[PDB]
């Protein structure tokens, strides 16, 4: 993820009196991903016994 940080200011208007300019400066940040797992095991004889109830 990033950030921008803009910058700039006014100088008041006038002909032949220069032009101010703007800019920016970015930064970044990182994080880590974690994953987990879980499973099951079912037997044929176990399955039928449970279906009775």
């Amino acid at each position: 993820q990033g950030i921008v940080e803009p910058a700039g200011t006014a100088v008041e208007y006038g002909d032949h009196t220069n032009i101010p300019l703007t800019s920016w400066n970015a930064n970044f940040e990182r994080r880590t991903i974690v994953r987990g797992e879980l499973g099951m095991m079912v037997g044929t004889l176990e399955e039928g016994r449970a279906s009775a109830i």
Binding site: R49, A50, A52, I53
Partner: protein
């Protein structure tokens, strides 16, 4: 460290299921009646009568 269960460990399936009941019923037999095969049967009178001469 292994946490405590809230229910008592037990076998899940009760024995009231898992049972097959044969469709039929066996009936007591007792002895036999064979007077008709010995002397035959004859209808003479009627119900609510008294005597035969």
């Amino acid at each position: 460290n292994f946490t405590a269960p809230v229910t008592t460990p037990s076998i899940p399936t009760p024995i009231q299921f898992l049972q097959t009941w044969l469709p039929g019923f066996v009936k007591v037999m007792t002895a036999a009646r064979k007077i008709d095969e010995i002397i035959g049967i004859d209808t003479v009178g009627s119900w609510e009568d008294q005597e035969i001469v």
